[PDB]
Amino acid sequence: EELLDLFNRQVTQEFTASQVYLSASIWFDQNDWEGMAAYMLAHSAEEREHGLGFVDFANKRNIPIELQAVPAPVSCAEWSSPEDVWQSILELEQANTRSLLNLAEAASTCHDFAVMAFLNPFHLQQVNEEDKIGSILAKVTDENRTPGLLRSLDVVSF
Amino acid sequence: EELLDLFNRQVTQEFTASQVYLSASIWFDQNDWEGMAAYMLAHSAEEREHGLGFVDFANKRNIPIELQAVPAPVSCAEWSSPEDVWQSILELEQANTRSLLNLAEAASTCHDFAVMAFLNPFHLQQVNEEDKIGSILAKVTDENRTPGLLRSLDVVSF
Amino acid sequence: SEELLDLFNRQVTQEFTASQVYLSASIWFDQNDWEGMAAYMLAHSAEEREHGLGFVDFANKRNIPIELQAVPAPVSCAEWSSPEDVWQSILELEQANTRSLLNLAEAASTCHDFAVMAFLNPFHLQQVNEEDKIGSILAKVTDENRTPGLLRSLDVVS
Amino acid sequence: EELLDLFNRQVTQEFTASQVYLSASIWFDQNDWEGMAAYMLAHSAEEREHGLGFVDFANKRNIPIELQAVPAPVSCAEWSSPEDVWQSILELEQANTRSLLNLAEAASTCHDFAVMAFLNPFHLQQVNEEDKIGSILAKVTDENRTPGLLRSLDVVS
Amino acid sequence: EELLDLFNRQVTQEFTASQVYLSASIWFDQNDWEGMAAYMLAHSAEEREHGLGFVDFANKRNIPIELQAVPAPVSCAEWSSPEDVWQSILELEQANTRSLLNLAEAASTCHDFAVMAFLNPFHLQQVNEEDKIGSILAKVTDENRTPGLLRSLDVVSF
Ligand SMILES: [Fe+3]
Ligand SMILES: [Fe+3]
Ligand SMILES: [Fe+3]
Ligand SMILES: [Fe+3]
Ligand SMILES: [Fe+3]
Ligand SMILES: [Fe+3]
Ligand SMILES: [Fe+3]
Ligand SMILES: [Fe+3]
Ligand SMILES: [Fe+3]
Ligand SMILES: [Fe+3]
Ligand SMILES: [Fe+3]
Ligand SMILES: [Fe+3]
Ligand SMILES: [Fe+3]
Ligand SMILES: [Fe+3]
Ligand SMILES: [Fe+3]
Ligand SMILES: [Fe+3]
Ligand SMILES: [Fe+3]
Ligand SMILES: [Fe+3]
Numbered sequence: 083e084e085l086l087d088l089f090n091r092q093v094t095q096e097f098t099a100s101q102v103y104l105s106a107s108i109w110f111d112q113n114d115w116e117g118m119a120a121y122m123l124a125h126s127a128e129e130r131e132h133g134l135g136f137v138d139f140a141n142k143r144n145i146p147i148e149l150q151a152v153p154a155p156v157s158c159a160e161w162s163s164p165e166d167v168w169q170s171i172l173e174l175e176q177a178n179t180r181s182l183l184n185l186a187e188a189a190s191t192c193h194d195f196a197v198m199a200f201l202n203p204f205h206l207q208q209v210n211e212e213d214k215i216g217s218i219l220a221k222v223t224d225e226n227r228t229p230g231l232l233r234s235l236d237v238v239s240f
Numbered sequence: 241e242e243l244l245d246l247f248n249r250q251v252t253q254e255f256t257a258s259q260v261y262l263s264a265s266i267w268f269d270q271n272d273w274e275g276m277a278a279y280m281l282a283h284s285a286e287e288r289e290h291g292l293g294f295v296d297f298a299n300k301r302n303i304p305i306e307l308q309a310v311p312a313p314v315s316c317a318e319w320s321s322p323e324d325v326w327q328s329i330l331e332l333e334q335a336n337t338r339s340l341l342n343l344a345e346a347a348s349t350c351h352d353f354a355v356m357a358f359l360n361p362f363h364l365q366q367v368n369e370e371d372k373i374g375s376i377l378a379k380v381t382d383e384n385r386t387p388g389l390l391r392s393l394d395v396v397s398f
Numbered sequence: 399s400e401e402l403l404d405l406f407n408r409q410v411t412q413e414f415t416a417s418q419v420y421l422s423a424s425i426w427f428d429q430n431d432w433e434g435m436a437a438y439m440l441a442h443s444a445e446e447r448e449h450g451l452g453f454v455d456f457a458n459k460r461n462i463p464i465e466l467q468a469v470p471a472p473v474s475c476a477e478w479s480s481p482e483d484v485w486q487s488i489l490e491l492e493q494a495n496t497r498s499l500l501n502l503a504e505a506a507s508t509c510h511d512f513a514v515m516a517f518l519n520p521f522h523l524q525q526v527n528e529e530d531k532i533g534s535i536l537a538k539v540t541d542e543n544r545t546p547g548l549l550r551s552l553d554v555v556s
Numbered sequence: 557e558e559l560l561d562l563f564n565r566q567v568t569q570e571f572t573a574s575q576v577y578l579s580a581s582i583w584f585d586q587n588d589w590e591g592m593a594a595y596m597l598a599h600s601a602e603e604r605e606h607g608l609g610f611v612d613f614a615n616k617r618n619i620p621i622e623l624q625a626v627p628a629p630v631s632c633a634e635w636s637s638p639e640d641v642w643q644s645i646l647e648l649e650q651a652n653t654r655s656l657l658n659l660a661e662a663a664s665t666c667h668d669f670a671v672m673a674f675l676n677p678f679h680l681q682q683v684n685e686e687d688k689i690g691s692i693l694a695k696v697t698d699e700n701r702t703p704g705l706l707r708s709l710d711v712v713s
Numbered sequence: 714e715e716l717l718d719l720f721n722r723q724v725t726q727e728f729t730a731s732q733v734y735l736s737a738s739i740w741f742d743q744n745d746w747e748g749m750a751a752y753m754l755a756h757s758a759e760e761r762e763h764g765l766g767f768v769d770f771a772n773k774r775n776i777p778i779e780l781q782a783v784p785a786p787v788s789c790a791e792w793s794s795p796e797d798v799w800q801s802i803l804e805l806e807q808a809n810t811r812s813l814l815n816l817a818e819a820a821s822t823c824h825d826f827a828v829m830a831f832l833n834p835f836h837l838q839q840v841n842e843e844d845k846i847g848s849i850l851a852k853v854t855d856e857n858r859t860p861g862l863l864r865s866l867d868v869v870s871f
Contacts, residue, residue, distance in 0.1 A: 114378040229385035237379070237397050255626075262611070263623050269615040272851040281608075288604070292597075295578070299585040300530040307579055310571075310626035353503045353515075354522040387858035395852070395870050537588040538711070544703035552708050616844040669817045670840050673833040 085188045085197070086145050089136065094150045095181050096133030100126045102174050105155035106167050115164060117240025132204070139200055165226055168219040175215055179208040243346045243355070244303050247294065252308045253339050254291030258284045260332050263313035264325050273322060275398025290362070297358055323384055326377040333373055337366040402505045403462055406453065406514070411467045412498050413450030417443050419491050422472035423484050432481060434553040456517055482543060485536040492532055496525045559666050562659045563610070563619050569655050570607030571626045574600045576648050579629035580641050591710040592638060606678070613674050639700060642693040649689055653682040716819045716828070717776050720767065725781045726812050727764030731757045733805050736786035737798050746795060748871025763835070770831055796857055799850040806846055810839040
C-alpha cells in the first residue's frame with residue numbers, strides 16, 4: 083500500500099510542479115521577460131507529460147490512481163527578481179528528484195522490478211534538469227550584477 | 241451621424257499614428273539606432289494599412305469619408321533618448337485603443353452589428369500591440385541603465 | 399426566448415427564399431439571352447442555399463428547432479422587362495436579407511445570446527460586401543444601358 | 557538654406573500627393589469605378605514610397621527632416637465625372653514635376669552633385685507618369701462622349 | 714589638363730584609402746578585434762576596386778594615367794582605441810567624398826558629361842559609406858563607455 087500511495091503522490095508532485103512552472107511564466111511575462119516566460123511555459127507542459135506518464139503506467143500495472151487537489155503555487159508572492167524565480171524552480175526540481183528517489187526506495191524494498199525499471203529514465207532526466215536549471219540560475223545571478231545586463235540575455239538566449 | 245463622424249476620425253487617427261511612427265524612425269536613424277528605426281518604419285506602414293482598411297469598409301458600407309489634415313508629429317521636439325521615443329509610441333497606441341473602443345461603443349448604441357464585427361480583430365490587435373510596445377519600453381528602460389548597453393541590443397535584437 | 403428562435407428560423411426561410419429569387423433571375427436572363435448575368439444569378443442562388451444550410455447546421459448544434467417553411471413562388475419576374483429591373487430586385491432582396499440579419503442580431507443581443515451573436519458576425523460582414531457588389535453592378539448596368547446594344551456587349555465581358 | 561527647405565517641402569509634396577490619390581480612389585469607389593479606384597490606390601502607395609525615399613536619403617545625407625502636416629485634399633468636392641478626377645491628378649503630377657525641377661536647380665547652384673544624382677531617376681519617372689496619366693485622360697475624355705461607354709472600359713483596365 | 718590631373722589623382726586617393734583600411738585591419742587584428750579587422754580588410758579591397766574602376770574608364774576615355782606613389786598610412790601611429798581608428802576612417806571617407814565632388818566640379822566646368830555620368834554612382838555610394846561609418850563610430854563610442862562592452866559586440870556584430 084505505501085508503494086501505491088507514493089506512486090499516486092508522484093502524479094500530484096508532477097502536476098504541482100507544472101503549476102509552479104506556469105506561475106513562473108506568468109511572473110516573467112508580467113515583468114516582460116518573454117524568453118524566460120517561454121522556457122517556463124514549455125517546462126510546465128513537460129511536467130504535465132511526466133505526470134500523465136505515471137498515470138498511464140499505473141493504469142497498466144493496476145495501481146489505483148486517485149487524483150488529488152493540485153495546490154495553488156504560492157512562491158510567486160515572494161518573487162521580486164528573476165533570481166528569486168529560478169531559485170524556486172531549482173528547489174522544486176530538487177524536491178521532484180527526492181520524491182522519485184523515495185519512490186524507487188519503496189519499489190526496491192518491495193522487489194518491484196517493473197517500477198524500478200520504469201523510473202530509471204526519470205532518475206537520469208532529473209540529473210540533467212537539475213544541472214541545467216543550476217547553470218541557468220548561476221548565469222542569472224552573475225549577469226544581474228550589472229544593471230540591465232540580464233535583460234540583454236533574455237533577448238539573445240531563450 | 242456621430243457614428244459616421246467617429247468612423248471618419250479613426251482614419252485620421254491611423255494616419256496620424258503612421259506619421260508619428262515615421263517621425264520616430266527619423267529620430268532613431270539620425271541618432272544611429274537603425275534597428276529601432278526599422279521597427280518604427282515598418283509600423284508606420286502598418287498604421288497606414290489600418291487606415292486604408294477603414295477607408296475600404298467605409299466605402300463598401302456607404303459611410304462618407306472626408307480625408308482630414310494629418311497633423312505634424314510634434315513629440316520629436318521633446319525626444320532626447322530612445323526611452324522618450326518608446327514612451328510616446330506607447331501613449332500613441334493607448335490612444336489608438338481608446339479611439340477604437342469609443343467607436344465600438346457608438347456602433348453598439350446604434351446596433352450597428354457590421355461595424356462591431358469589423359472592429360473585433362482591431363480590438364485584439366491593439367491588445368497585442370500595447371503588450372509588445374510595453375515590453376520593449378521596459379527592456380529599453382532597463383538596458384539603458386548601463387552606458388552603451390542599449391546600443392548593444394539595437395544590434396542583436398531588431 | 400421563443401421569439402429569438404422564430405427569428406433564427408425565419409433567417410433560414412429568408413435564405414431559401416432568396417435562393418429561389420436568384421434562380422428566377424437566372425431564368426429571366428437565360429430566356430432573354432443574357433447568359434453571363436444568368437450564370438452569376440445561378441451561382442448566387444447556390445450560395446444563398448449554402449447560407450441557409452449553415453444556419454440549419456448551427457441550429458441543430460445549438461438545439462434551436464427548425465421548422466422548414468414553404469419557399470414562396472417568386473413574383474418579381476412577372477414584372478421584369480429589362481436587366482435593370484432584375485438587378486434592382488436583387489439589390490432589394492439583399493437589403494431585406496441584411497435587415498433580417500440585423501433583426502436577428504438585436505434579438506440575440508437582448509437575450510445575451512453570445513453564441514448566436516458570434517455566429518452572425520461573418521454574415522454581417524458578408525452582407526456589406528454583397529450589397530456593395532450588387533449596387534455597383536446595378537450602377538454599371540444602368541449606365542451602360544443608356545446606349546443601345548452596349549449592355550450586351552458587356553454581358554460578354556463580365 | 558534654400559536647398560534644405562526645398563528638400564523638406566518635397567517630402568511634404570509626396571505625402572500630399574499620396575493623399576490626393578487616396579481621395580481620387582475614394583471618389584471612384586463611391587461612384588462604382590472599381591478599376592480606376594484600384595489604379596489610384598496603387599499610385600497613392602507609390603507617392604508615399606517616393607516620400608520615404610527622400611526621407612531615407614536625407615537621413616543619410618544629414619539633411620534635417622521636419623515632418624509637416626499633410627494637408628487635407630480639397631479637389632474631391634468639385635469632381636463630378638471621371639474626367640474631372642484624371643484632370644486633377646494630371647495637374648498634381650505636373651506640380652510634382654515642377655517642384656522636382658526647382659529642387660534640382662537649387663542643388664545645381666549649390667554644386668550638390670549627390671542630390672542631383674539622387675534626383676535623376678525621379679525626373680525620368682515623372683516623364684513616364686505624366687505621359688501615362690495624360691494618355692489615360694485622353695482616353696477617358698474620348699470614351700465619355702458616348703453614354704455608358706466609359707464604364708464599359710473601367711471593367712477592362 | 715586640370716581635369717585629367719584630378720582624374721589621375723582620384724586613382725591615388727582610392728589606393729591611399731585602400732592602404733589606410735589595410736592599416737586599420739592590422740591595428741584591429743593585432744589588438745584582437747577580428748570582426749572590425751575583417752570589415753576593414755573588405756573595405757580595403759573595395760577601395761582598390763574603385764581605383765581600378767577609374768583606371769579602366771580613363772583608359773577607355775584616353776585620359777593618360779600615371780600611377781603615383783601610394784603613401785605610407787601614418788594614422789596607425791596615433792591609434793590607441795577602436796574609437797581612434799573609426800574616427801580616422803570617417804575622415805578618410807569625408808576626404809574621398811570631397812575629392813569626388815571637386816572632380817565633378819571640374820568636369821562640370823569642362824562640360825564633360827561622360828565624366829559626370831561616370832561619377833554619379835560614386836557620389837551616391839559615398840553618401841551611403843559616410844552614413845554607415847558614421848553610425849558605426851557612434852555605436853563604438855557609446856559601447857566603449859562600459860569596460861569590455863565593445864568587445865562584446867565585435868563578436869556579435871561583424
Ligand atoms: Fe517532473
Ligand atoms: Fe522538470
Ligand atoms: Fe522532466
Ligand atoms: Fe493602428
Ligand atoms: Fe499600431
Ligand atoms: Fe496594428
Ligand atoms: Fe413564436
Ligand atoms: Fe415559433
Ligand atoms: Fe412556428
Ligand atoms: Fe444570404
Ligand atoms: Fe447573397
Ligand atoms: Fe452570401
Ligand atoms: Fe511622386
Ligand atoms: Fe506619381
Ligand atoms: Fe512615381
Ligand atoms: Fe573609395
Ligand atoms: Fe570607401
Ligand atoms: Fe565604396
